[PDB]
C-alpha cells in the first residue's frame, strides 16, 4: 500500500521509492532517492496498521529516538524520519554491500586478517555506542552492514536501550536477539556486557564458520548458552581462541569491556588489513606482499 | 492451495471442505464432512511448506502421536489423519460453540456456578490427561472448546508432552504458552504441575474477568509471574479466592494435584449446574428455582 513517492512535509524533501532490500519485523526496506539531489538512501517503512498497540508504538518510537542521536563511521547513518497516516518512514544510510550475514553465507569461515578487520570495525562502532550509554542488544551478522568499501555499519536499533543511570540493570528485553547473552536468559539484569557477549559469538562465527551455540531447537540453544556449552575447534589459533573465551563467559563481570578489546593480543599482534578488496566477498584473500 | 475435497487413501473416506474456523500456528481449521456418512468434523490442515525443518516436522508428529492416543468426554475427539504431498490433514471432533475464549469476550466475569461448571469439566479432562502421563502445557481459554451442549473439550496438543518415566523433569518447552508456569520461565524443569497452574489462571480469569498477570509487555508479565505478582479482588468469595491461591503458587510442589481439585471446598460446597442453557453464551443465568 506504500506510496511510490515518499514526501516529507517539514523538510520538503521527496523520495522516489525503488528496489526492495528485505523485511525485518514490521519493516520493509527500499532503496529510495531524494528526487531532487538524487542522493540515494535506504528507507525503512513501517505500516501503522501493525502499530495499533501503544507498546508497539513506543518501541518504534524508542528506536528512532536512539538511532537519531547517533553519528559514527561504523553506525548506519540516520538521515531522518517522517510519517503519513498509514506509514512511518525512516531514511537511513544505504549500504550497497548488504551485511556480514550474506558474506558469511558465501564464505563461511574467514581468514584471521579478515576477521581482525571486521571485528575492529564492529568494536569501534560499539565503543561509540557504549560511550553514549546505548546497548544495542542484538549485534549479529545480518545487523552488521557493509558499504561499498566493505566498511562495517552497525544497524537496526530496534532492541537497543539507553542506560539511564549508573549501575542500572535492564530487567527485560522485549525481543528475541540472535546471539543472546546468558544473563538475559536468566533474567538477572543486564547491561553493556551483553554486547561484548554478542561480539564474542560473532568472532567465533567469523573464525569458525558456524555460531558457537547452534542446535535444532532454539530452546536447546538457550540451554546451551545458560550452561556455557560450546567448544572451540583445535585449529583456531590460540590467541584468537583466548579472546573468544574471554568474551563468551557466563559471568558478565568477567568479560572484557568494549574498550579493553582492541588492546587484546588478537589485534595488536596480528596483521590487520587497512582495507579489503571486493574480491573477498567471494574469494579468500591471500594478502600477498607484491 | 488446499484441495476442495480431502481424500484419505487407506480409510477410503472423503471429506468436503467447508467453512473456515480460524488459524493457529501452521494450521487452518475447517468444517469438513465425510462425503459419504455426511458426518461433520473439524479439519486441521497444515501445509508441508511450513514443515521443511525436521524439528517442525517432529512437533507436528508428536502432536498427532499424543492426540491420537486420547479418548475422553472432555478432550477433543481424534478421528484420524492423513497427508498428501503438500498438506497434513487431521480430522477432529467439531465443537459447534467455539471456545471459552469467545464466551469470555462476550461475558467477561462468569457467575460462580458457571465457573464451577466449566472448571469441573476442564479438571476432569485434565485428570484424564495426567492419568495418561500427558501434560498439555498450554491450557487457556481459546483451547477449551465447547460443543453444542456447552461441554468442555480440551484441544490443541501442539505443546503437549509425554512423561516418559517417574520423576522426569521436562527441561524445555518449545513454544510460548499463554498461562505459562513460573518453573517454565525459570527453567528448573517442569511436570504435571504447570497444568494445575494454568487452571488456576483460568479460574481467576473466569471469576475475575481478566487474566491474573496481564500487563502491556509480555516480558513484564513473565516478570510478574516469576515474582508471583497478582492480586485477587476483594469481592471474589473467600473459598474461591482460596482455591485460586492454592493453584497459583510459585512452588510447584505446593500446588494441589489435578486429582485433589474436585474435592476442594470450592466444588463440594457450591452449587454445580448439571448443564447450562445456551442463553448463558450471552446472558448471565440466575439459576432460579422454578
Ligand atoms: C539479513 N540481510 C538481509 C538483506 N540485507 C541487505 C540487502 C540489500 C541491501 O541493499 C543493497 F542492495 F544496496 F546492498 C542492504 N543494505 C541496507 N542498507 C541500509 C539499511 C538496510 N539495508 C537495512 C536496515 C534494516 C533494519 N532492520 O534496520 N534492514 N535492512 C535491510 C533489509 O533487510 C537499516 C538500513 C542490506 C542485509 C541483511
Ligand atoms: C481462539 N478461538 C478461535 C475460534 N474458535 C472456533 C471457532 C469456530 C468453530 O467452529 C464452529 F463454528 F462450529 F463453532 C470452532 N470449533 C472447533 N472445533 C474443533 C476444533 C477446532 N475448532 C479447532 C482446533 C484448533 C487447534 N489449534 O487445534 N483450532 N480450532 C479452531 C480454529 O482456531 C481443534 C479442533 C472453534 C475457538 C478458538
Ligand atoms: Zn524448538
Ligand atoms: Zn514487550
> Which domains are seen in chain A, by residue range?
10-98 (3.30.200.20), 99-271 (1.10.510.10)
Cell for A230? 560450546
Q: Could you count the other beta carbons within 10 Å of the beta carbon of residue B53?
A: 10
| Ligand 2 pocket member B24 (CB < 6 A) | yes
| Ligand 2 pocket member B160 (CB < 6 A) | no
Cell for A12? 520538503
CA dist., res. A139 & res. A75, Å (int): 12
3-class secondary-structure state, position A249? coil
Nearest to A217 among B172, B185, B226 (CB): B172
Cell for A229? 556449552
CA proximity to A155, closest of A81, A76, A227: A76
Q: Cell match 473466569: residue?
A: B206
Tell me the residue ranges of DSSP E strands in A140-254: 144-146, 152-154, 161-162
Ligand 1 neighbours (beta carbon < 6 A): A 21-22, 24, 27, 29, 42, 44, 76, 92, 94-99, 101, 142, 145, 155-156
**List of chain A residues whose C-beta atoms are within 8 Å of the C-beta of residue B55:** 216-217
Nearest to A55 among B174, B187, B217 (CB): B217
CA dist., res. A139 & res. A100, Å (int): 11
Cell for B115? 465457573
Report DSSP state, residue B256: P
CA dist., res. A285 & res. A247, Å (int): 27
Burial A68-80 (b: 16+ CB within 10 A, else e): eebebebbbbbbe
Q: What is the CA radius of gyration of chain A?
A: 20
Residue A161: strand pairing partners: A135
Pairing of strands A5-7, A161-162: unpaired
CA dist., res. A259 & res. A115, Å (int): 18
Tell me the residue ranges of DSSP E strands in A48-141: 78-83, 87-92, 134-135
In A, what residues contact B, Cβ < 8 A?
53-55, 171-174, 185, 187, 216-220, 222-223, 226
Show Cβ contacts of residue A228 under 8 Å, excluding neighbours closer than 6 positions.
A182, A248, A249, A250
Phi, psi (rounded to 5 degrees) for A143: -100, -5
**In this structure, is the dihedral angle defined by the CA atoms of residues A185, A188, A190 and A196, taken in order, positive or negative?**
negative
Q: Which atom of ligand 1 is nearest to the CA of A23?
A: 33
Q: Where are the alpha helices (DSSP H) in chain B?
A: 54-68, 100-107, 112-131, 182-185, 193-208, 218-226, 238-247, 265-268
CB A154 within 8 A of CB A143: yes
CB A21 within 8 A of CB A29: yes
Our mutation pick for probing the ligand 2 site, out of B15, B17, B22, B177, counting the most ligand atoms within 8 A of Cβ, is B22
CB pairs under 8 A between A and B: 36
Q: Cell match 588478537: residue?
A: A266
| Ligand 2 pocket member B95 (CB < 6 A) | yes
The answer to whether the CB atoms of B219 and A53 lie below 8 A apart is: no
Residue B146: strand pairing partners: B152
Amino acid at each position: 500500500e506504500i506510496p511510490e513517492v515518499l514526501v516529507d512535509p517539514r523538510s520538503r524533501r521527496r523520495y522516489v521509492r525503488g528496489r526492495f532490500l528485505g523485511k525485518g519485523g514490521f519493516a520493509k526496506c527500499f532503496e529510495i532517492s531524494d528526487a531532487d539531489t538524487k542522493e540515494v538512501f535506504a528507507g525503512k517503512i513501517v505500516p501503522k496498521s501493525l502499530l495499533l498497540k501503544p507498546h508497539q508504538r513506543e518501541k518504534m518510537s524508542m528506536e528512532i529516538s536512539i538511532h537519531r542521536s547517533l553519528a559514527h563511521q561504523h553506525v548506519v547513518g540516520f538521515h531522518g524520519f517522517f510519517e503519513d497516516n498509514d506509514f512511518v518512514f525512516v531514511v537511513l544510510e544505504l549500504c550497497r554491500r548488504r551485511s556480514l550475514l550474506e558474506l558469511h553465507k558465501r564464505r563461511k569461515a574467514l581468514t584471521e586478517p579478515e576477521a581482525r578487520y571486521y571485528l575492529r570495525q564492529i568494536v569501534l562502532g560499539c565503543q561509540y555506542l557504549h560511550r553514549n550509554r546505548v546497548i544495542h542488544r542484538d549485534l549479529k551478522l545480518g545487523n552488521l552492514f557493509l558499504n561499498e568499501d566493505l566498511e562495517v555499519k552497525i544497524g537496526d536499533f530496534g532492541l537497543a536501550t539507553k542506560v539511564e543511570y549508573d549501575g542500572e540493570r535492564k530487567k527485560t528485553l522485549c525481543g528475541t536477539p540472535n546471539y543472546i547473552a546468558p544473563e538475559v536468559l536468566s533474567k538477572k539484569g543486564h547491561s553493556f556486557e551483553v554486547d561484548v557477549w554478542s561480539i564474542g559469538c560473532i568472532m567465533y562465527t567469523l573464525l569458525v564458520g558456524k555460531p558457537p551455540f547452534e542446535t535444532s531447537c532454539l530452546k536447546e540453544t538457550y540451554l546451551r548458552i545458560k550452561k556455557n556449552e560450546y567448544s572451540i575447534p583445535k585449529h583456531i589459533n590460540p590467541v584468537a581462541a583466548s579472546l573468544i573465551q574471554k568474551m563468551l563467559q557466563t559471568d558478565p563481570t568477567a568479560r572484557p569491556t568494549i574498550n579493553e578489546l582492541l588492546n587484546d593480543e588478537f589485534f595488536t599482534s596480528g596483521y590487520i588489513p587497512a582495507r579489503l578488496p571486493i574480491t573477498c566477498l567471494t574469494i579468500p584473500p591471500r594478502f600477498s606482499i607484491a
